[PDB]
Amino acid sequence: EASLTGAGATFPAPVYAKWADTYQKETGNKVNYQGIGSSGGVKQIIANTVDFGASDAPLSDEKLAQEGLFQFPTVIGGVVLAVNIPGLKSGELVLDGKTLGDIYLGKIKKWDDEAIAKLNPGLKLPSQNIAVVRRAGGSGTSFVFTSYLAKVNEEWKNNVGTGSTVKWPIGLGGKGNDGIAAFVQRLPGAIGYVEYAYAKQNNLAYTKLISADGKPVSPTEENFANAAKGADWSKTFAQDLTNQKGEDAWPITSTTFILIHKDQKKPEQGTEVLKFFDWAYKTGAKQANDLDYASLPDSVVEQVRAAWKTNIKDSSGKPLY
Ligand SMILES: [Br-]
CATH class of the missing domain: 3.40.190.10 (Periplasmic binding protein-like II)
Structure with a gap:
């Protein structure tokens, strides 16, 4: 059982909290999410004080590359x-x-x-x-x-x-x-x-x-x-x-994004972050829907999965997914 921490956007906090609660009941894993605002979410992930940052505003590709960050969308609100x-x-x-x-x-x-x-x-x-x-x-x-x-x-x-x-x-x-x-x-x-x-x-x-x-x-x-x-996700997640x-x-x-480091120094944490979000895509649709957030199309989640395998690694270049 892992203990994870995220921080950021209050826009999707209702569904993240719900997903966190359920995930703990089914697996024991604990996700502690702090709704402090997308701006804070970004500062915290860059300061490495949390396992994942959450922002509704997307970072540009250049900004992501400069900070060594990877961004993926979760829901539509x-x-x-x-x-x-x-x-x-x-x-x-x-x-x-x-x-x-x-x-x-x-x-x-x-x-x-x-x-x-x-x-x-x-x-x-x-x-x-x-x-x-x-x-x-x-x-x-x-x-x-x-x-x-x-x-x-x-x-x-x-x-x-x-x-x-x-x-x-x-x-x-x-x-x-x-x-x-x-x-x-x-x-x-x-x-x-x-x-x-x-x-x-x-x-x-x-x-x-x-x-x-x-x-x-x-x-x-x-x-x-x-x-x-009408969004061409194949082109970019930053729609x-x-x-x-x-x-x-x-x-x-608007969709909303999760920010994680590409070079994971605490790979165990990173693996567990990925598993929580993977579980949420695989099983959290009804909970997002109950809270009136629309799910991303399956093609987008597949794109996110492929990008995880390609972008998220431990300091030895080993993918975490
Ligand atoms: Br505020």
């Missing part, structure tokens, strides 16, 4: 806009990218702004103030959210840009996906971006969004998967799944 609007239920409100950006730009301050009124004709919107909530530190969720906004709102693109950390025009800072959930839940009129599972598990209302194709879509596990149907074309493609979709 989606970022949603949790809202606390009195007298509105979950799924009722529809926003489009431009409008979501203007709210984040602080240009739209009330829940009944003409712009929101127009996207929701049958709606009885309150003249309530918009309480914008965003992430306090370096965040992979912030990375995919800002990547999406830069694509749909020119002013956001030019003035704030994309990043795990950006100069937010407005908004209160929340720590972790859980911190944003908690804030929205306590602030009437709040809007905060969270990975879908955090909204569902906390019974937060969320909005629908309009797809790149121009249609209103609901955030569901299938819709996160739809957004990725941008935001604002993708296609039917029922959730526009703020």
Whole structure:
């Protein structure tokens, strides 16, 4: 029985924790995962203070090569806009990218702004103030959210840009996906971006969004998967799944990555990390699905397996898989 430690992205923490719990019950192995943020996840793996780092933002090929890291995706999730609007239920409100950006730009301050009124004709919107909530530190969720906004709102693109950390025009800072959930839940009129599972598990209302194709879509596990149907994984694991074309493609979709060293100095640890993730691909789909994360296609996992055999070695060049 091995004792493993990972750290990083809170975006997939619900499924990683679930997989960890089950894995221990079936095999005795213990995986301790700390949701500290994708930025931290990266610093820790590079500082070798954990067996594996987790980040939603991918490292470029050059950056991976420079640090001697290997990156592989695990699941597909989606970022949603949790809202606390009195007298509105979950799924009722529809926003489009431009409008979501203007709210984040602080240009739209009330829940009944003409712009929101127009996207929701049958709606009885309150003249309530918009309480914008965003992430306090370096965040992979912030990375995919800002990547999406830069694509749909020119002013956001030019003035704030994309990043795990950006100069937010407005908004209160929340720590972790859980911190944003908690804030929205306590602030009437709040809007905060969270990975879908955090909204569902906390019974937060969320909005629908309009797809790149121009249609209103609901955030569901299938819709996160739809957004990725067009990705050419054979080309690279570092797929941008935001604002993708296609039917029922959730526009703020993203995979998430696990980072491990190519040259394993504690090969036993490395072997066990690989076995845990291999077990998760082989047997963890239902648990990811129960938590509304979509599984990667089998062809992608096979690619990941082949790359493990090719890239992960002990200091004597011996593969660990
Ligand atoms: Br944070």
